[PDB]
């Protein structure tokens, strides 16, 4: 269907210790394809997906140059924002940035985004029009006026509507085999007595891609979140994901309960019954 390219940057100040650490990762959909770590030895953008390895030395030179510039910018930003908030040089603080673009099934630009956080809280975001900013507080309004004067939105808009989408389309082509696949979940149920009175039913989804999935329990067709446990979707390690949902039911009543699995790779949702 639609696809996305996203970069995730984390900068953490290490007071007492050395320079702040900067880590960048790039994803297409739920597949990571590059990383940069300011502490690693290479000091280069590195491949993390088979289909990005065919990019030439100029690709890696450019992406290293630019992400290294970003890392210096985000180190400067940690001290700047410490000043904005009048915080001491003693505490550790975090700047996060997420940016990227979505394309539709036709491959045409759907939306772009850029949002920044400080200590895990929203700081400033590029608005949906890619022409204006939404600041979270007074410190962020200083940044907004700075970026308005510097025409920073124009720089991001031209990237998000241009090279972001063009290079995403290229990655989807070069990694058709991985990125344009859907792996339907392999499903099963387990059943374990809690006592004579009760038993746990656990509904499993394994080996699926993309990560998006819905697991729901019903009892005689009624939505059932009472006594249910839903774990966060988790990576299997091989590029697929896993999820389960459990419910505790009265012994002998297992037949009333259905687990409902919805996933893009399933032409019709599955219903599982013990």
């Amino acid at each position: 269907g639609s696809h996305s390219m996203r970069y995730f940057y984390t900068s953490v100040s290490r007071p007492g210790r050395g320079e702040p650490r900067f880590i960048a990762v790039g994803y297409v959909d739920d597949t990571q394809f590059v990383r940069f770590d300011s502490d690693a030895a290479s000091q280069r953008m590195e491949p993390r997906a088979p289909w990005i390895e065919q990019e030439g030395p100029e690709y890696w030179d450019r992406n290293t140059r630019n992400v290294k510039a970003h890392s210096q910018t985000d180190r400067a930003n940690l001290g700047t924002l410490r000043g904005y908030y009048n915080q001491s040089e003693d505490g550790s603080h975090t700047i996060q940035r997420m940016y990227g673009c979505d394309v539709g099934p036709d491959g045409r630009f759907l939306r772009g985004y850029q949002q920044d956080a400080y200590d895990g809280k929203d700081y400033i975001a590029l608005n949906e029009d890619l022409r204006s900013w939404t600041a979270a507080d007074m410190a962020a309004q200083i940044t907004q006026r700075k970026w308005e004067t510097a025409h920073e939105a124009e720089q991001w808009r031209a990237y998000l509507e241009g090279r972001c989408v063009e290079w995403l389309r290229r990655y989807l082509e070069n990694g058709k085999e991985t990125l344009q696949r859907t792996d339907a979940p392999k499903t099963h149920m387990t059943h374990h007595a809690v006592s004579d009175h009760e038993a746990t039913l656990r509904c499993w989804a394994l080996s699926f891609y993309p990560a998006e999935i819905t697991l729901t329990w019903q009892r005689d067709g009624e939505d059932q979140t009472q006594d249910t446990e839903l774990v966060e979707t988790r990576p299997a390690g091989d590029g697929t994901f896993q999820k389960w949902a459990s419910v505790v039911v009265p012994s002998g009543q297992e037949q009333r309960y259905t687990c409902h699995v919805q996933h893009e790779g399933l032409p019709k949702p599955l219903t599982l019954r013990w």
Binding site: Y7, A24, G26, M45, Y59, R62, N63, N66, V67, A69, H70, T73, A76, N77, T80, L81, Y99, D116, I124, T143, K146, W147, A150, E152, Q155, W156, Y159, R163, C164, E166, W167
Partner: peptide
């Protein structure tokens, strides 16, 4: 392909 130069905060 990452973004180009980003303006400081």
């Amino acid at each position: 392909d990452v973004m180009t130069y980003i303006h400081s905060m």
